Each structure stands twice: as structure tokens, then as C-alpha cells.
Amino acid sequence: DRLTQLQDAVNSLADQFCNAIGVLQNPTEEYAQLFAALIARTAKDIDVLIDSLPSEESTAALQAASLYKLEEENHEAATCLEDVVYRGDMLLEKIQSALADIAQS
Amino acid sequence: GNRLRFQLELEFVQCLANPNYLNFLAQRGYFKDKAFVNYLKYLLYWKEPEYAKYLKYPQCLHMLELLQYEHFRKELVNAQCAKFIDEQQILHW
Amino acid sequence: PPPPMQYIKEYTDENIQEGLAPKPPPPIKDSYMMFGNQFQCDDLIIRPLESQGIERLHPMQFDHKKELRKLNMSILINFLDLLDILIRSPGSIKREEKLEDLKLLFVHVHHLINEYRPHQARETLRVMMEVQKRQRLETAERFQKHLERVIEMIQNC
Amino acid sequence: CEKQVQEVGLDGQPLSMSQNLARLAQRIDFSQ
Known part of the structure; x- marks a missing residue:
């Protein structure tokens, strides 16, 4: 979710740092203050995004365990849904047989 | 076989995936023989996530499956369909 | 470049071989044309690869x-020092520091995306399974x- | 599981009457 967000934040921080390094050398003071505010906000946002990012499947075990649990839950739900669909199809077949018998009269 | 032949087959699939080679490969007449159809059926076995990942062009399997028909091949041989596919790929890229 | 050579000989509809007449085997092994997997933070940027990862329920x-926050702060401090140097000293000074900071930022962004x-x-898969259920x-x-x-309605009449 | 391709198929859906009509036209074409 925040992956591309943090990527764009880091890119914008690097671009702002380069622009500040290029424009560093009260117009000068105001430009330096604006570049400082921009760079500080970008760095703080990047840090907060990296801290509040998804702390999970960076390695290879937590993501695998979560996927296995999700697959087990999905299999149980699919079995329940198959039972329910079989019951509904049986009811529909009974209704269709009753309708055919009524029409045969 | 086994490495050079596989790399060559993958490169040929990636080349045929593009609409430019559609007019060049059709002029060669290789699709007219059953050898091309057999090679396509053999390469279709690589649809699993082990060999198709090596193919940079992800739209190669769909184009190969569509080129099996004669009408689709004749349509892709034209320049209008090639330009349309190129425009779609450029808008999607 | 037609690479499918010897197609008429191998792929033949007259009399097929045992099981490998037209078999176009793919490069699953013995072919470093991927390469093996991808790039890493050890060959390009020769430095201490800072990485970490926790298990489930932790x-x-x-x-x-x-x-990552410490690396970003260090890169920002280095960029500020390089900007001060290039503003006080001549221009062609902070180029290497800016390039290193950009490379570190790109590596961190790639790591965050992969994580x-x-x-x-x-x-998303769990949410889709729950929605289907x-x-x-x-x-x-x-x-x-x-x-x-x-x-x-039936028992009504 | 891993059915997001079909779960996110929002034009990219009840029993279509046109599909049934086409199937009947293909079936009632000749009593083979």
C-alpha cells in the first residue's frame, strides 16, 4: 500500500536535496528556509512511512504462515459454501420436479 | 537441447509476441507447416510459474494462443491490427 | 531471428517419438539468462547491507x-554537508555524495516495495476469501x- | 484461494439470456 508512496517520498527527498545543493549558491535566506522545510518534511514523512509500513513478509516465514492460514480458512469456507450450494441445488431440483409434475397434469 | 535451445525458443517466443514480427514470420510460411503448431503446443507446457517468468513479455502466451487460428493470423498479418496492438501496448506501458 | 531450427525433423506428425519428438524444453535449469534471481545490495553498493525481518505474530x-530511519537520516545529513560544501567551495564537489544518497534512497525504496x-x-487474498464466504x-x-x-405460498392454496 | 483474477473481474453477472439464446440456436439448428 505505502510502498510506492515511500518510494516517491524518497525520490522527492533526493530531488529536493539536489535542488537545494544547486540553488544554495532576503532571497537566498528565504530559498534556503523553503528548501530546509521541504527536505525536513520529506525526510520525516519517509521515516514515518518506513516505520508504519507493513512489518511482516520482508523475510520468508511470516508471509508464508499468513498465506497458509488464509488458504486453510478459504478451504473451510469453500467446503461450507459447497455444502450450502448443494443444498440449494437440491431444493431447486425438487422445485423443478414439482413444477414439471404439475405441468404434466 | 538443453540450455541454448531453450534460450533460443524463449527468444523466438518473445519475438513472435510482438506485432512487428507477425508480418515477417507469416511471410516465412513456418506457421503453414505442422512443425510450428507442434512447437507451440510444446512451448505451451511452460505456462507454470517456473518458465513463463523468464519470458519478459507477459503477453506472449495470449498472442501465441490467438495465433493458432488462421483468421487471427491473417488479421495479425495486416498492418492495421499490428498498429492497433502497438498503440494498446504503448498506452498500457 | 527464427531460432526454432530443425522443426520439421523433430516435430513430425507422421510418426512421433517416445515422448520428446517436438518437446521444446524450457530453461528451468542450467541457464543463467535470468540471472539466478536478481540484484542485491552487496555487489553494486559495496557496504554493510542493513536488513532485518521478523517472523509471524511478532x-x-x-x-x-x-x-532504515537511521540510514535515511545519515543520507540526509551527508546531503546537507555536501550542499554546504558545494555552496562554500566550488560546484563539482557534492556530485559523489548526491549520487550515493540517491542510490541509497533507491535501494531503500526497492526494499520497502519488496517488503x-x-x-x-x-x-488482499484473505479479504477476498472472507468476501466470498x-x-x-x-x-x-x-x-x-x-x-x-x-x-x-404452496400450502396457502 | 488466489482467485483475485476472477474476484476483481469488474468488466475486465447473472445467467445471461443471450448466452442461452445462442446455445439454443447452436442446438436447435439441426436434430443431429
């Missing part, structure tokens, strides 16, 4: 996020209520 405990992709995919249960309940209403 957070990183400031292992990967804290290291956030699998967790997001698993969460809920829709199936709702459809079953609606079918049961409809059958009850049908039985009521």
Missing part, C-alpha cells in the same frame, strides 16, 4: 524500520428464505 521491534508487496497480497452465506440464506416463502 513485530520487527525496531530492527528494519529503525535501521510491502507480499503482506499486501496476503491481506460472506457472499456464499448470504446467497444460501436468501435461497433458504425464498424456499420458505415458496412452501408458504
Whole structure:
């Protein structure tokens, strides 16, 4: 979710740092203050995004365990849904047989 | 076989995936023989996530499956369909 | 470049071989044309590769996020020092520091993307499974209520 | 599981009457 967000934040921080390094050398003071505010906000946002990012499947075990649990839950739900669909199809077949018998009269 | 032949087959699939080679490969007449159809059926076995990942062009399997028909091949041989596919790929890229 | 050579000999509809007449085997092994996997943070940027990762039911405990924040702060401080140097001293000074900071930022962005992709995919798959289960249960309940209403209308007459 | 391709198929859906009509036209074409 925040992956591309943090990527764009880091890119914008690097671009702002380069622009500040290029424009560093009260117009000068105001430009330096604006570049400082921009760079500080970008760095703080990047840090907060990296801290509040998804702390999970960076390695290879937590993501695998979560996927296995999700697959087990999905299999149980699919079995329940198959039972329910079989019951509904049986009811529909009974209704269709009753309708055919009524029409045969 | 086994490495050079596989790399060559993958490169040929990636080349045929593009609409430019559609007019060049059709002029060669290789699709007219059953050898091309057999090679396509053999390469279709690589649809699993082990060999198709090596193919940079992800739209190669769909184009190969569509080129099996004669009408689709004749349509892709034209320049209008090639330009349309190129425009779609450029808008999607 | 037609690479499929010897197609008429191998792929033949007259009399096929045992099981490998037209078999176009793919480069699953013995072919470093991928390469093996991908790039890493050890060959390009020769430096201490800061990385971390926690298991399930446990957070990183400031292992990967804290290291990434420290690296970002160090890169920002180096960029500020390089800007001060290039503003006081001549221009062609801060180029190497800017390039190193940009490379570090790109590496960190790639690492964050790779870390956030699998967790997001698993969460989306779990949400989709839950939504499918809920829709199936709702459809079953609606079918049961409809059958009850049908039985009521039948026994009415 | 891993059915997001079909779960996110929002134009990219009850029993279509046109599909049934086409199937009947293909079936009632000749009593083979």
C-alpha cells in the first residue's frame, strides 16, 4: 500500500536535496528556509512511512504462515459454501420436479 | 537441447509476441507447416510459474494462443491490427 | 531471428517419438539468462547491507524500520554537508555524495516495495476469501428464505 | 484461494439470456 508512496517520498527527498545543493549558491535566506522545510518534511514523512509500513513478509516465514492460514480458512469456507450450494441445488431440483409434475397434469 | 535451445525458443517466443514480427514470420510460411503448431503446443507446457517468468513479455502466451487460428493470423498479418496492438501496448506501458 | 531450427525433423506428425519428438524444453535449469534471481545490495553498493525481518505474530521491534530511519537520516545529513560544501567551495564537489544518497534512497525504496508487496497480497487474498464466504452465506440464506416463502405460498392454496 | 483474477473481474453477472439464446440456436439448428 505505502510502498510506492515511500518510494516517491524518497525520490522527492533526493530531488529536493539536489535542488537545494544547486540553488544554495532576503532571497537566498528565504530559498534556503523553503528548501530546509521541504527536505525536513520529506525526510520525516519517509521515516514515518518506513516505520508504519507493513512489518511482516520482508523475510520468508511470516508471509508464508499468513498465506497458509488464509488458504486453510478459504478451504473451510469453500467446503461450507459447497455444502450450502448443494443444498440449494437440491431444493431447486425438487422445485423443478414439482413444477414439471404439475405441468404434466 | 538443453540450455541454448531453450534460450533460443524463449527468444523466438518473445519475438513472435510482438506485432512487428507477425508480418515477417507469416511471410516465412513456418506457421503453414505442422512443425510450428507442434512447437507451440510444446512451448505451451511452460505456462507454470517456473518458465513463463523468464519470458519478459507477459503477453506472449495470449498472442501465441490467438495465433493458432488462421483468421487471427491473417488479421495479425495486416498492418492495421499490428498498429492497433502497438498503440494498446504503448498506452498500457 | 527464427531460432526454432530443425522443426520439421523433430516435430513430425507422421510418426512421433517416445515422448520428446517436438518437446521444446524450457530453461528451468542450467541457464543463467535470468540471472539466478536478481540484484542485491552487496555487489553494486559495496557496504554493510542493513536488513532485518521478523517472523509471524511478532513485530520487527525496531530492527528494519529503525535501521532504515537511521540510514535515511545519515543520507540526509551527508546531503546537507555536501550542499554546504558545494555552496562554500566550488560546484563539482557534492556530485559523489548526491549520487550515493540517491542510490541509497533507491535501494531503500526497492526494499520497502519488496517488503510491502507480499503482506499486501496476503491481506488482499484473505479479504477476498472472507468476501466470498460472506457472499456464499448470504446467497444460501436468501435461497433458504425464498424456499420458505415458496412452501408458504404452496400450502396457502 | 488466489482467485483475485476472477474476484476483481469488474468488466475486465447473472445467467445471461443471450448466452442461452445462442446455445439454443447452436442446438436447435439441426436434430443431429
